[PDB]
Scaffold this active site. Structure first.
Site, PDB file in Angstrom:
ATOM      1  N   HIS A  22     -12.750  -2.107  -3.025  1.00  0.00           N
ATOM      2  CA  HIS A  22     -12.365  -0.498  -3.359  1.00  0.00           C
ATOM      3  C   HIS A  22     -11.091  -0.521  -3.837  1.00  0.00           C
ATOM      4  O   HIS A  22     -10.725   0.564  -4.060  1.00  0.00           O
ATOM      5  CB  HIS A  22     -12.827   0.200  -1.927  1.00  0.00           C
ATOM      6  CG  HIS A  22     -11.782  -0.029  -0.753  1.00  0.00           C
ATOM      7  ND1 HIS A  22     -10.342   0.302  -0.922  1.00  0.00           N
ATOM      8  CD2 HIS A  22     -11.889  -0.385   0.340  1.00  0.00           C
ATOM      9  CE1 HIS A  22      -9.826   0.164   0.340  1.00  0.00           C
ATOM     10  NE2 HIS A  22     -10.830  -0.185   1.208  1.00  0.00           N
ATOM     11  N   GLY A  27      -2.858   1.816   3.035  1.00  0.00           N
ATOM     12  CA  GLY A  27      -2.242   0.824   2.174  1.00  0.00           C
ATOM     13  C   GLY A  27      -2.483  -0.299   3.094  1.00  0.00           C
ATOM     14  O   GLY A  27      -1.974  -1.477   2.415  1.00  0.00           O
ATOM     15  N   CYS A  70      -5.291  -1.789   3.931  1.00  0.00           N
ATOM     16  CA  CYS A  70      -6.612  -2.562   3.478  1.00  0.00           C
ATOM     17  C   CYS A  70      -6.171  -4.101   2.832  1.00  0.00           C
ATOM     18  O   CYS A  70      -5.274  -4.127   2.261  1.00  0.00           O
ATOM     19  CB  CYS A  70      -7.324  -1.668   2.342  1.00  0.00           C
ATOM     20  SG  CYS A  70      -7.813   0.008   3.107  1.00  0.00           S
TER      21      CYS A  70
HETATM   22  O1  LIG Z   1      -6.868   1.980   8.174  1.00  0.00           O
HETATM   23  C1  LIG Z   1      -6.862   2.558   7.292  1.00  0.00           C
HETATM   24  C2  LIG Z   1      -7.368   2.212   5.932  1.00  0.00           C
HETATM   25  C3  LIG Z   1      -7.316   3.326   4.724  1.00  0.00           C
HETATM   26  C4  LIG Z   1      -8.782   3.689   4.538  1.00  0.00           C
HETATM   27  O2  LIG Z   1      -9.540   3.984   5.352  1.00  0.00           O
HETATM   28  N1  LIG Z   1      -8.799   3.639   3.257  1.00  0.00           N
HETATM   29  C5  LIG Z   1     -10.237   3.614   2.514  1.00  0.00           C
HETATM   30  C6  LIG Z   1     -10.247   3.450   1.254  1.00  0.00           C
HETATM   31  C7  LIG Z   1     -11.519   3.304   0.378  1.00  0.00           C
HETATM   32  C8  LIG Z   1     -12.446   3.579   1.277  1.00  0.00           C
HETATM   33 CL1  LIG Z   1     -14.067   3.508   0.303  1.00  0.00          CL
HETATM   34  C9  LIG Z   1     -12.495   3.840   2.632  1.00  0.00           C
HETATM   35  N2  LIG Z   1     -11.170   3.895   3.214  1.00  0.00           N
HETATM   36  C10 LIG Z   1      -6.463   4.437   5.587  1.00  0.00           C
HETATM   37  C11 LIG Z   1      -5.840   5.492   5.139  1.00  0.00           C
HETATM   38  C12 LIG Z   1      -5.530   6.490   6.271  1.00  0.00           C
HETATM   39  C13 LIG Z   1      -5.394   5.864   7.256  1.00  0.00           C
HETATM   40  C14 LIG Z   1      -5.588   4.614   7.597  1.00  0.00           C
HETATM   41  C15 LIG Z   1      -6.332   4.061   6.765  1.00  0.00           C
HETATM   42 NA    NA Z   2     -14.221  -2.466  -0.199  1.00  0.00          NA
END
Ligand SMILES: O=C1C[C@@H](C(=O)Nc2ccc(Cl)cn2)c2ccccc21
Ligand code: NA
Ligand SMILES: O=C1C[C@@H](C(=O)Nc2ccc(Cl)cn2)c2ccccc21
Ligand code: NA
Ligand code: NA
Ligand code: NA
Lengths: 306, 306
Positions: free
Chosen positions: B41, B143, B145
């Site tokens: 992603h 950030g 990931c």
């Molecule tokens: O723990 C995490 C990882 C990040 C997250 O979910 N990002 C993400 C990015 C792409 C897709 Cl398809 C789905 N989710 C995130 C953002 C805010 C807070 C925590 C987190």
């Molecule tokens: Na992914």
């Protein structure tokens, strides 16, 4: 989101651990530049530990009696000296893995990471607090002496703790890196009183802020209090008295959440007087005091090291 | 003595973390030999995440669109491929810090350490369990990931987890290093059901053994039970059913303590039915399920890595 008891990444410290042997005692040492630091009780035999005369025992030792090994490789000892409860072994090679570092003496209620080591090899890393009575509640078996505690600020390791002993009560005592014990303890196998301990109030409040930031909000109430009123409750429940310095350190978390510090004190008062009625906060059924306000902001803001 | 939630020393993994940027998305990658592994992603824009067509988005990208930086230094990308939910970027330099490593797919109830990273730089390390419903209860901000989970066996790092997403419920989901999600999850910003979760019974029993080894013994009782009787109680309290395989894994701890596994089950039954009456076990007011039997023996026996 989520909140965990997070340790600092240990790699910069793993590169500094060595094994030190003197006679039939092996423990850990810390190799920075051309000096290895380790607990002076490496020079004691099992008999010696009831009441060691460290000056007399060290006079019997020469440089060649200290065996220092860094992984597979032997270091050459060209000097030794005792500073308080630590030995400093000067070696002929500077550690090529020495990080930027400082030696600091931490205050009670501050937190640090411990790299638990045996035979100069790392086994694990965990975060803990210096208790108000200057003990730590660690995880340390025989052979862990000379394991160290530390904090990191970007690229700089601040060493604050070297492990020396397990008290008969099963809590832990040690020194700063100049060999001065935290608390009243001495490096002798004797029963030794630790103070009355207390709960680190400013840390509990920081953790309640952490809980709010993460959406655990059930404990927020309609009440406020004063410093004087709160501190009467603190005394009853063996909590550290809250000072305006503590209020000021909690300023950023108060601003982030919009909950006044004294309103959060009134929440904590109600939790002290009523308990948690079988509920949890950030996965805990107790009030947690091993996160500093600086810890909560760092974790909640994704601060990194190099 | 003492018992802590201990992570593996993180240095062997810190040497493998890199930053990957594609368009305006930066996350973490894992550099082993001449391959960088990261969540696919990285190729998505904020719009894309509601229902990304990963095949179509990746066709728009060439090698030169993937910016990979290892500390201060840029890596040259000479190939890219998508395997399930991970991208594999072939680079022209083998990582000189590559440890001995394996990729493993862990079972629910197993534990591992997470090295939380932002912009390719480590922020902290903590231990957790793969829940029975294949989520993890981590600490992850935007950030994070591409941060990874792992276990170490002496000199060998077994990578088991790569972080991909925070579900709207605030728990965490990710893949093995072949890019297969744990559980039913997909890499889309959508509400996604996690199973009913359950408590990892064999881990709670391991932790009760840990408590006995450390002298916390108040919960030991005059009672025994059967697997069938215990499992009726397990069902009522949403605990995993106990199997003879679990009994066999607990054999060493039973032998060390002289407490038969079914006698410890009868202690756990009484704790489930009566609660802990405001008492604690190893500093916890809840029954803890993030220690495996292997974890308890390793911690209680001072096993090291290199
Ligand atoms: O723990 C995490 C990882 C990040 C997250 O979910 N990002 C993400 C990015 C792409 C897709 Cl398809 C789905 N989710 C995130 C953002 C805010 C807070 C925590 C987190
Ligand atoms: Na992914
Ligand atoms: O945590 C530890 C450190 C180690 C210990 O206390 N050893 C020691 C050695 C010399 C003197 Cl003067 C006093 N104590 C120990 C032995 C058994 C279990 C735990 C620990
Ligand atoms: Na000493
Ligand atoms: Na101490
Ligand atoms: Na998952």
């Amino acid at each position: 989101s989520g909140f965990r008891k997070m340790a600092f990444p240990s790699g910069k410290v793993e590169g500094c651990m060595v094994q030190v042997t003197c006679g039939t005692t092996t423990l850990n040492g810390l190799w920075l530049d051309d000096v290895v630091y380790c607990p002076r009780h490496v020079i004691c035999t099992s008999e010696d530990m009831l009441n060691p005369n460290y000056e007399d025992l060290l006079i019997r030792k020469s440089n060649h009696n200290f065996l220092v090994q860094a992984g597979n490789v032997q270091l050459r000892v060209i000097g030794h000296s005792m500073q308080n409860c630590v030995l400093k072994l000067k070696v002929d090679t500077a550690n090529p893995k020495t990080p930027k570092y400082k030696f600091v003496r931490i205050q009670p209620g501050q937190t640090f990471s411990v790299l638990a080591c045996y035979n100069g090899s790392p086994s694990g890393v965990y975060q803990c607090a210096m208790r108000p009575n200057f003990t730590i509640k660690g995880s340390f078996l025989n052979g862990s002496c000379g394991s160290v505690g530390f904090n990191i600020d970007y690229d700089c390791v601040s060493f604050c703790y070297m492990h020396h002993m397990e008290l008969p009560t099963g809590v832990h005592a040690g020194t700063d890196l100049e060999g001065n014990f935290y608390g009243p303890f001495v490096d002798r196998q004797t029963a030794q009183a630790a103070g009355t301990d207390t709960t680190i109030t400013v840390n509990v409040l920081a953790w309640l802020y952490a809980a709010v930031i993460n959406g655990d909000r059930w404990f927020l109430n309609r009440f406020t209090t004063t410093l004087n009123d709160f501190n009467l409750v603190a005394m009853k429940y063996n909590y550290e008295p809250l000072t305006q310095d503590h209020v000021d350190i909690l300023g950023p978390l108060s601003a982030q959440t919009g909950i006044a510090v004294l309103d959060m004190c009134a929440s904590l008062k109600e939790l002290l007087q009523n308990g948690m009625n079988g509920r949890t906060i950030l996965g805990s059924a107790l009030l947690e005091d091993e996160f500093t306000p600086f810890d909560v902001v760092r974790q909640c803001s994704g601060v990194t090291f190099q």
